[PDB]
Ligand binder design. Structure first.
Ligand SMILES: *SCC1=CC(C)(C)N(O)C1(C)C
Ligand SMILES: *SCC1=CC(C)(C)N(O)C1(C)C
Ligand SMILES: *SCC1=CC(C)(C)N(O)C1(C)C
Length: 127
């Protein structure tokens, strides 16, 4: 075959890979602390997202959307524009169970938070 794997490998990998578990260990272990971490040259994006598919990286919108820096307020659209279509992917909670820990837990968030705060500012809003 040109791509085949057993359930444990297939599902666990799919669920994990798609869900937060796979991405959790892969990105965590690969990246090493998601809160902190910034790369220069890149497709502008791809990785470090709340269970969102790596999409939305436009050609001409980079500045418009990537206005997060100055007009940091405007980016509010980036979420107010197409989100109403993703804001239905909530059931992912059950899958995104891990979303539960950081929700009903959260540790490697408050800490990096005090730095993030410094490393960026916090001058932002999130829901
Ligand atoms: S950290 C591993 C990783 C991240 C990303 C930039 C999405 N990649 O292409 C690899 C798989 C190398
Ligand atoms: S990891 C950098 C990054 C990309 C994008 C998905 C746009 N983000 O929300 C952050 C700022 C985490
Ligand atoms: S589980 C990730 C998370 C943390 C917090 C900031 C409390 N949240 O609202 C979500 C659930 C997105």
């Amino acid at each position: 075959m040109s791509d085949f794997d057993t359930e444990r490998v297939s599902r666990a990998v799919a669920a994990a890979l798609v869900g937060p578990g796979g991405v959790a260990l892969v990105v965590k272990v690969c990246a090493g602390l998601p809160g902190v971490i910034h790369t220069p040259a890149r497709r502008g994006f791809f990785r470090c997202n709340p269970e969102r598919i790596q999409i939305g990286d436009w050609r001409y919108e980079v500045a418009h959307d990537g206005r997060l820096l100055a007009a940091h307020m405007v980016n509010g659209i980036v979420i107010a524009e197409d989100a109403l279509i993703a804001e239905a992917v909530g059931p992912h909670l059950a899958r995104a169970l891990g979303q539960i820990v950081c929700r009903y837990g959260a540790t490697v968030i408050p800490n990096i938070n005090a730095a993030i705060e410094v490393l960026g500012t916090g001058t932002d809003y999130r829901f």
